[PDB]
Amino acid sequence: LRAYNEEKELALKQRLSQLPPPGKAFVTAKEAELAELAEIAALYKTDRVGILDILLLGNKHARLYRDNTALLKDYYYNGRRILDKIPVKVTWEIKREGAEKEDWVNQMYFLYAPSLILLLIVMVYKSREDITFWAKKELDQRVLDKHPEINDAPENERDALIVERIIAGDYDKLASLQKKAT
Amino acid sequence: ILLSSLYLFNRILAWQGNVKHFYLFASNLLLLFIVVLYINFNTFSNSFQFNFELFNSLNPFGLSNSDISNGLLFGIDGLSLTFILLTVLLIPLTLLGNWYNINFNSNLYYTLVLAIGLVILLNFWALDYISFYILFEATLPLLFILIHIYGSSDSERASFYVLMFTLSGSLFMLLSIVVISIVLNTTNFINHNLFVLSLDLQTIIWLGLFIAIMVKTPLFPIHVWLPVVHSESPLAGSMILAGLILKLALYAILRLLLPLLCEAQILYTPMIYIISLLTIILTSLATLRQIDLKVIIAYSSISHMGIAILGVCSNTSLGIYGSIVLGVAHGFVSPALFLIVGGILYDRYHIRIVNYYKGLTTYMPQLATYIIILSFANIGTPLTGNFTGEFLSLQGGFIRNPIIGGISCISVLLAAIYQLKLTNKLTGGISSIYMHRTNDVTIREKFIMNILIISTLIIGICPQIMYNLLYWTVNNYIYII
Amino acid sequence: FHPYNTLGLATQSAMVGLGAGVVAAAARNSLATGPRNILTTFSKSGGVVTIFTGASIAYVFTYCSAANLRERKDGWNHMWAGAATGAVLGARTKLVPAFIGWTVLCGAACGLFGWTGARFNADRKASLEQSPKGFVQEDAHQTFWEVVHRRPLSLTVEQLGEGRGINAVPIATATEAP
Amino acid sequence: HQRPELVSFDDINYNDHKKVREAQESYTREQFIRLEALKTVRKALEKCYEESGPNHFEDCKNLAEQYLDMLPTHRLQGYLGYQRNDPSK
Amino acid sequence: MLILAIISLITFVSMSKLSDNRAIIRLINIYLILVLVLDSFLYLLFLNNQTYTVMGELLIFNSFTFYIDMLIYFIMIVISSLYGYNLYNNNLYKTLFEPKKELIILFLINILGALLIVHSNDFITLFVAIELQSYSIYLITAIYNSSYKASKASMLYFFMGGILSILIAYSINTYYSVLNSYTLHSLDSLIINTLDLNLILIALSLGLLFKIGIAPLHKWLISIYENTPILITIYISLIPKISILSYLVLSNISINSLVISILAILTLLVGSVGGLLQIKIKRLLAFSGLTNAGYMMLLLLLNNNEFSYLYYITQYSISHLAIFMIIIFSIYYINYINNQYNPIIYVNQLKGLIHDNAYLVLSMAIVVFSFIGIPPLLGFFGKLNILMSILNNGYYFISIVLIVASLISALYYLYLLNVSIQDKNNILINSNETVSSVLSYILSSLIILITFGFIYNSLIIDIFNVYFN
Amino acid sequence: DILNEEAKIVQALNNQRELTIKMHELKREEKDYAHSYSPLFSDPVPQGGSIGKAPGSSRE
Ligand SMILES: CCCCCCCCCCC(CCCCCCCCCC)(CO[C@H]1O[C@@H](CO)[C@H](O[C@@H]2O[C@@H](CO)[C@H](O)[C@@H](O)[C@@H]2O)[C@@H](O)[C@@H]1O)CO[C@H]1O[C@@H](CO)[C@H](O[C@@H]2O[C@@H](CO)[C@H](O)[C@@H](O)[C@@H]2O)[C@@H](O)[C@H]1O
Numbered sequence A: 001l002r003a004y005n006e007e008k009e010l011a012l013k014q015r016l017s018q019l020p021p022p023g024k025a026f027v028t029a030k031e032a033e034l035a036e037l038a039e040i041a042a043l044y045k046t047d048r049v050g051i052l053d054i055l056l057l058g059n060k061h062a063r064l065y066r067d068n069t070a071l072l073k074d075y076y077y078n079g080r081r082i083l084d085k086i087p088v089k090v091t092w093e094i095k096r097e098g099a100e101k102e103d104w105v106n107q108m109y110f111l112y113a114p115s116l117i118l119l120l121i122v123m124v125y126k127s128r129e130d131i132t133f134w135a136k137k138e139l140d141q142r143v144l145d146k147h148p149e150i151n152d153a154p155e156n157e158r159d160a161l162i163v164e165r166i167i168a169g170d171y172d173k174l175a176s177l178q179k180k181a182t
Numbered sequence B: 001i002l003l004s005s006l007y008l009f010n011r012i013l014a015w016q017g018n019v020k021h022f023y024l025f026a027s028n029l030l031l032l033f034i035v036v037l038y039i040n041f042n043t044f045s046n047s048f049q050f051n052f053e054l055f056n057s058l059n060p061f062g063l064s065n066s067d068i069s070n071g072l073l074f075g076i077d078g079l080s081l082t083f084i085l086l087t088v089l090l091i092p093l094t095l096l097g098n099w100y101n102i103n104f105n106s107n108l109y110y111t112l113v114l115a116i117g118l119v120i121l122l123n124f125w126a127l128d129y130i131s132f133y134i135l136f137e138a139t140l141p142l143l144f145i146l147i148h149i150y151g152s153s154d155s156e157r158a159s160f161y162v163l164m165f166t167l168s169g170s171l172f173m174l175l176s177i178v179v180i181s182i183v184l185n186t187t188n189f190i191n192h193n194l195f196v197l198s199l200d201l202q203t204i205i206w207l208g209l210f211i212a213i214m215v216k217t218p219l220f221p222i223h224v225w226l227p228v229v230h231s232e233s234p235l236a237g238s239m240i241l242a243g244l245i246l247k248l249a250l251y252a253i254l255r256l257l258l259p260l261l262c263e264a265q266i267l268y269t270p271m272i273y274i275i276s277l278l279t280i281i282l283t284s285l286a287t288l289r290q291i292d293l294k295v296i297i298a299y300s301s302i303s304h305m306g307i308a309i310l311g312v313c314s315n316t317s318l319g320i321y322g323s324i325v326l327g328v329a330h331g332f333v334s335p336a337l338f339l340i341v342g343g344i345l346y347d348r349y350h351i352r353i354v355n356y357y358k359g360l361t362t363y364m365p366q367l368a369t370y371i372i373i374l375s376f377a378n379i380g381t382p383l384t385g386n387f388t389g390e391f392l393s394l395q396g397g398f399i400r401n402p403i404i405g406g407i408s409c410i411s412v413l414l415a416a417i418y419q420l421k422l423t424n425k426l427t428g429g430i431s432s433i434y435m436h437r438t439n440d441v442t443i444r445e446k447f448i449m450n451i452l453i454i455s456t457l458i459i460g461i462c463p464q465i466m467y468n469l470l471y472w473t474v475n476n477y478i479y480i481i
Numbered sequence C: 001f002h003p004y005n006t007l008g009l010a011t012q013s014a015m016v017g018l019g020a021g022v023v024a025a026a027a028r029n030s031l032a033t034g035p036r037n038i039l040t041t042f043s044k045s046g047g048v049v050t051i052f053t054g055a056s057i058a059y060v061f062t063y064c065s066a067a068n069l070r071e072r073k074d075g076w077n078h079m080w081a082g083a084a085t086g087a088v089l090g091a092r093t094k095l096v097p098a099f100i101g102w103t104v105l106c107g108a109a110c111g112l113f114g115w116t117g118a119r120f121n122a123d124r125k126a127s128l129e130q131s132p133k134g135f136v137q138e139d140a141h142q143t144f145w146e147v148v149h150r151r152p153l154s155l156t157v158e159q160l161g162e163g164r165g166i167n168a169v170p171i172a173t174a175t176e177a178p
Numbered sequence D: 001h002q003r004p005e006l007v008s009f010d011d012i013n014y015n016d017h018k019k020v021r022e023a024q025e026s027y028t029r030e031q032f033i034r035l036e037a038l039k040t041v042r043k044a045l046e047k048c049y050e051e052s053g054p055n056h057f058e059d060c061k062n063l064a065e066q067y068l069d070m071l072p073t074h075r076l077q078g079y080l081g082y083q084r085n086d087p088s089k
Numbered sequence E: 001m002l003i004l005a006i007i008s009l010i011t012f013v014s015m016s017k018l019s020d021n022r023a024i025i026r027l028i029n030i031y032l033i034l035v036l037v038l039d040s041f042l043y044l045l046f047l048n049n050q051t052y053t054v055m056g057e058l059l060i061f062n063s064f065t066f067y068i069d070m071l072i073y074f075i076m077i078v079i080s081s082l083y084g085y086n087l088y089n090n091n092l093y094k095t096l097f098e099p100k101k102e103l104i105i106l107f108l109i110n111i112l113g114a115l116l117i118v119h120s121n122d123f124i125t126l127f128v129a130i131e132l133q134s135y136s137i138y139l140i141t142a143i144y145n146s147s148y149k150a151s152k153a154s155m156l157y158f159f160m161g162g163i164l165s166i167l168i169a170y171s172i173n174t175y176y177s178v179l180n181s182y183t184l185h186s187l188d189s190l191i192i193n194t195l196d197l198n199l200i201l202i203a204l205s206l207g208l209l210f211k212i213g214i215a216p217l218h219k220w221l222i223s224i225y226e227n228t229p230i231l232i233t234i235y236i237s238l239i240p241k242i243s244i245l246s247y248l249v250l251s252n253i254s255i256n257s258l259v260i261s262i263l264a265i266l267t268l269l270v271g272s273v274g275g276l277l278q279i280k281i282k283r284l285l286a287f288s289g290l291t292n293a294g295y296m297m298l299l300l301l302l303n304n305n306e307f308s309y310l311y312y313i314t315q316y317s318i319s320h321l322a323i324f325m326i327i328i329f330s331i332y333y334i335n336y337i338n339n340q341y342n343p344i345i346y347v348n349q350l351k352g353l354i355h356d357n358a359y360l361v362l363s364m365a366i367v368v369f370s371f372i373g374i375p376p377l378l379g380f381f382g383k384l385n386i387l388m389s390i391l392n393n394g395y396y397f398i399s400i401v402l403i404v405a406s407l408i409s410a411l412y413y414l415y416l417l418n419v420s421i422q423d424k425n426n427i428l429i430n431s432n433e434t435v436s437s438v439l440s441y442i443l444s445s446l447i448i449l450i451t452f453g454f455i456y457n458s459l460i461i462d463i464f465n466v467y468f469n
Numbered sequence F: 001d002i003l004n005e006e007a008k009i010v011q012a013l014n015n016q017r018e019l020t021i022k023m024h025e026l027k028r029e030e031k032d033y034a035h036s037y038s039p040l041f042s043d044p045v046p047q048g049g050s051i052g053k054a055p056g057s058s059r060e
């Protein structure tokens, strides 16, 4: 994506130059000047350059475009704040319903929020490898290794028999590890 | 990469002029990267995993591949991963909560906020006493500048408090760390439970560590700086200070104190319980007579920290799990309450006195609903992580000492009192005469609040979802023969 | 512990405080502006001689008295001595809050001084640099600066006491069946 | 399903960190197995009570007594007590 | 190299016109730099801590003295740049900063005296070097003789330094009367046990230490610092302190001294508390110097002090140079020039400096936080090394007093930054004249050292282990 | 692998501890007169003035 134009920019500056400062540019509330304010402010949401030129070009063009965008943003937002009208459609239409994206939405909804969803999914499935399940299986395997005949028993009897063996006998190894306590 | 990414930063700054979109993007990438690390984190192992060393003599500007370790060590276990996740969840929200209300010199403001976040995140990676202490102190000048330049009317006194109190406690911690350094000639957290100092020297080292803990938590009676600092700070400062920085003290108890000074800790536990019970009761009662919204919210954090302390010093697995869960849930809910009082109401009316506010429900029903939800979350309504943390902390405290934990059970009531006294006046009655009608909560404010509420609800319904990172931790630090 | 002779030591303190106050009065007389004669040195002393004498008496007498009564020597005696000294110095304010503040805060500062060893330089023989350090040998008793990998469980039971998890025998060994 | 080899604090040299880590993990895992045994006893007790009703006092006496016996001894206790103390001395 | 420079400079300056002054200084500046980079390799002589007695045992050369000599050369380079290079090219700055004809010679002779103090192995060498440095410093204080304050300061310096020189001479002669010797090398453990030298050696220590202004004899030197021209103050408050402290560190004649312990405590308390009500920048910096002198005084109580002393003195010298340079740079942005010798006097004149030059205030913040001791700035590691040293040797009460003094002095350090980041009503829009490239680069190099030097900490310790063990 | 890496790091840390204790001890060992004072003229015994050198003034 490349979208810059120095030719357009150096003239946009003068098209700004005729206008009053954006602080005082709407304090009348004629309609012709307000219409030009509408068009020039509408330029704020018409994106003027992409990546291939911010990366490649030089800082004089950058400083000029930066300045232009500063005054455009001031005009757009001041008209929107005083008149209650969006500066599109091009003379200051009222149609506020929709078509209003803030500059944080894309990041927070397509990077931050999916990241949080992925974190929740990862926690849910990471909780499956929890020590409580490992120790359940390990107790069962110790019992099955000491008393293999309950393997021969059918499925539905088997679990009751493992439970019986667990209840009767102390299959942990904690005291074994405590060698020096005699 | 670093060269290319610096060029990217420079060009973005040249053309846009506001650094904040780049900072939001960098922090979101950091959160995604931490989630990828969690994906590749082995849970069936109590050993530190993503290790690296900085400023080794053989490679001062690189990573150390040497047989002698003389740089600063970094790495993570499950405990540190928990707090790292909390940190990277919170940082982008602290950027987004000041998106529109910072207008003069905003690039510096966002730089300070992001730097403070990154320093805390690195602090949770530190694997030795010196690296921990360095990242512990490095936040103080950044906070001083941030509060002094972008705080409210009393922000000079506040910046001086946030610097001086924390330096005061940190220097006694520094005495303790120096003593450990010269007595053991080692400073790392990987093997420090293998060194058993004499009980007397243990008793002495504990005092410095605990003075620092007392100022940073804070605990009674050295808490009085926190309401001032919270009240005068800009919103991102308050969110970081209540959600992250106070958790560093709980983490310090687990990481720096319990593994090394076990016997002295046993000896000192009743004194800790005295201090924590005083914190809970006295600060809860002192909250009842406050007239500043942000001060009231700030006072709430101190009592919850007291409950967490009681849990973490209980010498039980349930108490330590409850302390960590309480820390995380507080990190969700307290930044939301600070967002309400110092971000939404304060940006509309520029005042914090309680007498001016009454009956907001009429024009702002959505904000009133958020207030009600966050209030009942803050006082530990079940199905909220706050309830799980408080309940488990009180269980551990009661086992450790039945009388002291039993008396600690009054915090349920006391917190209910101060919080619901505030919300009753905020939502009910006729709309106030002193203020004009403003907009109800915006899409950005609702987004932040929704993130925090969903997080606290998810860990409130199923607290077990943290256990896969913490089940070694709930056994690593208890001292039973 | 054999007792301090409180009376004689305190009399010595009286003499030294009087001398030091006299010296301070002479210096005060020489450093000041305005007319000054040889007798005005005590007239315009500011009571400095009394400051010195009273502090000397209070500190030395109280320290010796507390040491003899407790039959100990440690920082607590200096805490009491500093409390009494602060009482004397805060009496000059003639206000009860200030008198109390001097009492407790001087007592605390002097207790801190006594706890560190009651010296301004170092006790060189006891210091870490002049002491056995590092890991102890085979079965030696651990000394103040030495480190071990395992302490004896009997020592832990003696020092912490039995209860709340500290036991003479590990639990699993004791609850093993046969 | 993993079954790491069990290692005791009493045998190893505290300077091989691999052995010390294995001993700590062994101690913790054995405690979790003990917790599993206690949970098994408790679950059997609940089943016995729910199927016995008014005569649970008779039919579940052994299970009730055994659960109450194992409650104080089959909880998590950590490893620091045993690694930092030598029971022989 | 130094002696040669002094001889050549006397001749050249004698044949030169007053307009050549700055040019001459520039020449000497580059000469010093060359000596630092071509003669550096001589460090190899001291591998494995080999010590050399030189000049019939009048002088001692080891790794410690070689390092101190390099540091003094670096300091002289930095300070002479401030006279050889104009900050701005306007008329006011010509009036503010013009080097005197003989100033460079006085600086080089004073540096010679300092380096001879550092290397002194015999007491006759020590006394000749001390008088060389003292006489030079009096003349440096006086050479701006249109100033009433500077001439009065020079008289006060002459008389107080003369009394202290007499105390030092009397100490040396009592030592001779007891031992029939003029060298500390004749002291052995057996001699120290057998004889009471404590009164003699402490008298010598106090004579040396009052010359750099420890408490309770601090006010006279602080007055001299306040009342000299600022570019003189940068030199005279640093070089003597380094030379005297380095000699006392290397001599180790006051180990576990009770008197030095009490005076160090008093110096820390006086330096921290007495800086609190100061409103003049140079008085504030003088009390800061007093507190840091107390920190270094603590190292005279113990053996094996070399690493912590060298680290502390290096980072302190860097920070002192940086803060004076920042104050000098801020002169361009102030509303009111108080006089031609001290263009800026009051801390309040820095108010709102951030709106005129933001990165100057960033440099100030870094330096101030280093003085306070925030990691990972160099000041933190200096204080950490000192604490390790004193706690290894049992100085517990003094360690607590050190912590308290650090906290107290943080208040007056933060005063500078506090006023500097407030708002001012009329802020700078543009200006055609830029400050000098050379001096700005030097200041930035100092700031970068303070900020990132910690990266080399373990490498530095490795080298220290082979040159000082 | 996690255990092996952690053990290697702990070994390097113990190596650094051993080196620190070794340098501490070596720095406190007393050096020879040649290494500490004078490596060429290495005899500490003085000769004094040579003018009126008196037979019998030399004493070991
Ligand atoms: C965060 C708050 C900071 C404030 C708290 C600091 C308080 C420091 C106090 C503790 C400590 C320094 C420890 C320093 C450790 C690091 C320092 C920590 C940072 C310092 C900032 C000072 O202990 C002092 O306590 C005072 C009493 O209060 C005494 O006062 C005086 O009492 C009277 C004189 O006889 C006079 O009448 C009067 O002169 C005072 O009345 C002092 O003499 C005494 O030295 C203890 O050190 C010492 O402990 C002893 C036995 O423990 C060690 O030797 C042991 O010998 C056997 C038994 O002896 C053991 O069998 C053996 O195993 C072990 O070898 C020593 O080798 C040494 O190490």
Ligand SMILES: CCCCC/C=C/C/C=C\CCCCCCCC(=O)O[C@H](COC(=O)CCCCCCCCCCCCCCC)COP(=O)([O-])OCC[N+](C)(C)C
Pocket: E036, E037, E038, E040, E041, E043, E063, E066, E067, E070, E071, E074, E306, E307, E310, E311, E314, E315, E378, E449, E452, E453, E454, E456, E460, E463, E464, E467
């Ligand atoms: C090409 C010639 C250039 C040499 C010119 C040197 C000028 C010195 C000027 C100013 C002093 C600044 C500090 C000197 C550095 C100490 C070196 C050393 O390691 O100090 C050690 C002794 O450590 C100590 O006691 C402690 C020193 C405390 C330093 C505290 C500041 C640390 C921050 C500095 C960061 C380094 C910046 C590097 C930038 C990439 C002596 O080393 P050494 O005596 O064997 O001599 C080195 C070989 N040399 C002659 C060729 C250079």
Ligand SMILES: CCCCCCCCCCCCCCCCCC(=O)OC[C@H](COP(=O)(O)OCCN)OC(=O)CCCCCCCCCCCCCCCCC
Pocket: B049, B050, B051, B052, B054, B063, B115, B118, B119, B121, B122, B125, B134, B135, B138, E375, E376
């Ligand atoms: C001024 C305050 C004091 C400053 C002192 C400390 C300054 C530190 C400067 C920040 C730099 C630290 C972060 C970068 C280091 C990590 C680089 C790395 O590669 O980590 C190595 C580790 C293992 O990698 P390896 O052994 O090579 O094997 C790879 C197999 N594929 O690979 C990993 O496991 C990944 C490790 C991820 C660590 C997360 C780091 C999060 C924060 C990163 C930026 C923090 C910036 C903070 C800036 C404020 C200053 C504190």
